[model samples]
Target: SNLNLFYTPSEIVNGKTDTGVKPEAGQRIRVGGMVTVGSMVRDPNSLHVQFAVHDSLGGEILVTYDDLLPDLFREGQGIVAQGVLGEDGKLAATEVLAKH
Candidate 1:
């Protein structure tokens, strides 16, 4: 569909168009970054989880998921998440993969 499907945390948070327009909401995209230290949180009665992703440029994005994450998922680990940006600016991940 020619949609932008890839982005870094910084780009997702700060990207602008040629006319100084911000990217549209609800775009499906992928973001790669290190899992910020001590950022993982789990829901007490559900599988829901939340964490922060940090890029080399000091940008960070919050992510949430309801499915089981890979066993390799951990703080400071490299990972990529594919999802649509939520209204609150957090990524609602549909899939997450650990970087080898």
Candidate 2:
């Protein structure tokens, strides 16, 4: 499920789970889940890519990668996004790993 065996979207990103409110920013983390269908937005002839990864309980987070994506990367595939979470709700991805 979410946090990919770790935490949920609210617990991890939002930090408003009533447990403790420690907003996360600039802290590098790795999330595991499936690529959200129809969420991929990559410009033609451009290496920049943006998409959402959905996990258990229907949690989804935005991810943006400015480098060349791996050859096996695709929408709806189970993968891992390693990077830092940003403001407003998005991940500045540093690497995309295939868990498909």
Candidate 3:
């Protein structure tokens, strides 16, 4: 499986390492959560987009994508982003998967 279920955005934000080692910045990972309401933005002339995700514990993660987004992906829906974590504590998404 390409998705690494071990770390969620929640864990990352909280810096939780109970499941295993916390992923370092620049490493691609599979992270999923509920898209925060009214936190999505897209470029009118390009596929570039940005959004925020929140977990059950109220942890938040910011994500940026520069590709075609799934039709099912919407604000407040659950989704997974596969990408590299940035030093700025945001995700640079390479792929987005529909999860809800």
Candidate 4:
């Protein structure tokens, strides 16, 4: 057995914690991740958006938005989604921050 095989939740913890304030609906948030290729989706009838965020370690997290998104949104860029998770287990993002 490989005793050195250990897993840590630091990535998830950093994503969910390290916040200056508690996250709430319609509030802004900062997340770190690389955009998952070909994961961007936009609804024609509404402002709803969906995408995937990936970390350097290949950690992937599905995110959704329900408001206007920044123009910099695209694959291969780092982004932080701000919003609340909807009933369908999708993030209802109100804002998105892209890293250069």
Candidate 5:
């Protein structure tokens, strides 16, 4: 069974540990935040897409997906992305959910 866990960028990037531990690369996690303005990018010939997500508290993360994006996906809109963190510190999303 897989963990259906959720996290904020801050929690993932700056773990609760006093030593400032961060989430391990390749660990699956879900993060929710508003899509950063002017951060959405897409491949002209493919389904590849990338965007930045940021929380109200200023935490942010870059997310990349190679699948059809929800029609409602847009900058400044709230969204949640689930995937494993990559070695490059980006979320290689397996799923994305738009939030009103």
Candidate 6:
């Protein structure tokens, strides 16, 4: 089902899908876990940000955003990302939701 959810990092990385199948871009994904330490970086003049999304595998993703992020978003917390992958090979997000 499209609602397939992954609670563990291994489930996400090891799950099987048909070859050549592409994940639907712009899908809303919920990644719940403590944020990696020393992962948040804010830009000087814009809403641009970079951080790592980590679970149990030390799996980290370099995310970049150019929009107003949610007020609760920060490192060492759970967060959800709603975005599309960028041409530059990183997740280019438009919305970020941080959980306490």
**Weakest 10 consecutive residues, lDDT, candidate 1?**
16-25
Off by over 4 Å in 1: 2-4, 15-21
Q: Which scores better on TM-score, 1 or 4?
A: 1
- Model 3 Cα lDDT, one tens digit per residue, 50-74: 8888888888877888776777366
List lDDT for all candidates, in order: 0.72, 0.64, 0.72, 0.55, 0.72, 0.54
TM-score for each model: 0.80, 0.73, 0.77, 0.61, 0.80, 0.63
Candidate no. 4 TM-score? 0.61
Candidate 1, backbone clash total: 0
Q: What is the lDDT of residue 51 in candidate 1?
A: 88
Give the per-residue Cα lDDT of candidate 5 at 50.
84
lDDT (0-100) at residue 97 of candidate 4? Answer: 59
**In model 4, which regions exceed 4 Å deviation?**
1-10, 13-29, 87-89
Put down candidate 5 lDDT per residue, 1-100, tens digits, no spaces: 6655767765655543112355556667788777888898888855888888878877677788878787736677788899777644778886787755
lDDT (Cα, 0-100) at 7 in candidate 5 = 74
Ten contiguous residues minimizing lDDT sum, candidate 4: 1-10
lDDT preference between candidates 2 and 4, better one:
2
Superposed on all Cα atoms, the candidates' RMSDs to the truth, in angstroms, are 3.3, 4.9, 3.8, 10.3, 3.1, 4.3
lDDT of 6 by residue, 32-59 (tens): 4456778778788656777766676765
Q: Write the per-residue lDDT of candidate 2 for residues 1-100, one digit (tens) a residue.
A: 2232323443454443222356445556676777777988887868888887777667666777877788636776678778666553666776777856
Give the deviation of candidate 4 from the true structure as CA RMSD.
10.3
Cα shift from native, residue 5, model 3 (Å): 3.6
Instruction: Tell me the TM-score of model 3.
Output: 0.77
**Clash pairs detected, candidate 2:** none
* Model 6 poorest 10 in a row by lDDT: 11-20
Clashes by residue pair, model 3? none
Candidate 6 residue 34 Cα shift, in angstroms, is 3.8
